[PDB]
Structure 1
Amino acid sequence: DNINTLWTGVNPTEANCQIMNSSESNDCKLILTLVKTGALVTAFVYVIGVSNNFNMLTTHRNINFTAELFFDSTGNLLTRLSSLKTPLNHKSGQNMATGAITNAKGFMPSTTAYPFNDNSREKENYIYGTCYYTASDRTAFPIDISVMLNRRAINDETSYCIRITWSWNTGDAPEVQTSATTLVTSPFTFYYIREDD
């Protein structure tokens, strides 16, 4: 009954993702949940800033940062390459179910729907949406999200790919120095066709 989720847990104790390649250690919490809904997978992603370099972004007008998830042939997470450094797992209450994942492949984007290195179908690999940032003054600041599915595989061990880029390009930064506390993106839910189990 719980094998239909594959997520990162709720509010991990420590950072589990390195989004900024400049940071020396994990600089944010990436909360990613994947749910099997028939032939589709519902993906529920957002980020909580932990490091100061990551939180200072709200003081700038043009910001962009990407989380890259690479999965091997069986759908396990490649922590040596991915932004997320903690392997995904099933739901055990409000935590990750410590145990072996045997049906990870079912949660991965379909290579049929989102092919690799196929220029003719390149446009099929893109998804778009908008999340929000709640300012210290209660205003909703929109953040564009671009998701790229299995379109490129740099490392030979990569069989599936998911890149989620949060970017905003406005005229006034959401925060000023003395007001910026943390960067929390409103949850983004996107659907993608899933690979056969």
Structure 2
Amino acid sequence: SINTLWTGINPPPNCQIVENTNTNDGKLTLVLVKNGGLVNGYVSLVGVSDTVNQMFTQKTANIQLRLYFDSSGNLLTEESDLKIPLKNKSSSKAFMPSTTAYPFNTTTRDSENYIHGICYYMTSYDRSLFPLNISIMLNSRMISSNVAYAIQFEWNLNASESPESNIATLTTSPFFFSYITED
């Protein structure tokens, strides 16, 4: 119990997808559950701005969300794309990605710093599914400051046709993952 760090169910716009957009244009739902040596995660994204919700009118698209954490395990909102700190339900460090399992400053050892999977986008018209490649990069590149941990999410759409012809709420079906915690 009380072993859950998250963005809260239906959070307000809390991240920035478009660079240079003083306003949050996306809604990221991230749920991290401590479960022994593993963190059980859940991640889905919803777009809010007209710009975000138009990215799927093109056959190709990329969305990246970077989370940087300090030694205590607190989200460094100024440097991260997620602008609202995570909470608990009703020791953030225990929800963080092991710097041992996932080491920093290493390209010789950067490969074991990635989780790769597939999630989907359901079109607004015929409700068809477009697969989205999703990658989660743990630690590895500490942007700067006193970044003690990092979690970067990236969704990539690479289709032969555009999933939408016009504005439609961008949504990424839920991607499940786990990673070894710093305990």
Is the structural similarity TM-score above 0.5?
Answer: yes
The aligned residue for residue 172 of structure 2 is 185
Matched residue SS, 2:44: strand
**Runs of at least 5 residues in structure 1 that lack an aligned partner in the other structure:** 93-102
Question: Is residue 105 from structure 1 mapped to residue 61 from structure 2 by the alignment?
Answer: no
Question: Is residue 24 from structure 1 mapped to residue 22 from structure 2 by the alignment?
Answer: yes
- Deviation sequence 1:44-96 (CA, Å, 0-9, x none): 1111111111000110111001000000001000011111111101012xxxx
* Superposed displacement of residue 123, structure 1: 1.3
* Superposed displacement of residue 127, structure 1: 0.8
The aligned residue for residue 58 of structure 1 is 56
Matched residue SS, 1:9: coil
Q: Which of 34, 38, 43 lines up with 1:45 in the alignment?
A: 43
* Superposed displacement of residue 171, structure 1: 1.1
Matched residue SS, 1:52: coil
**Runs of at least 5 residues in structure 2 that lack an aligned partner in the other structure:** none
Question: Is residue 148 from structure 1 mapped to residue 137 from structure 2 by the alignment?
Answer: yes
Q: Which amino acid aligns with 1:82?
A: S
Structure-2 separation of matches of 1:119 and 1:8? 30
Matched residue SS, 1:16: coil
Report the RMSD for the aligned CA atoms in angstroms. Answer: 1.0
Corresponding pairs, count = 182
Structure-1 separation of matches of 2:132 and 2:59? 11
Structure-1 separation of matches of 2:173 and 2:163? 14
TM-score (structure 2 length as normaliser)? 0.96
TM-score (structure 1 length as normaliser)? 0.89
Structure-1 separation of matches of 2:139 and 2:173? 25
The aligned residue for residue 107 of structure 2 is 119
Q: Which amino acid aligns with 1:140?
A: L
Structure-2 separation of matches of 1:107 and 1:126? 17
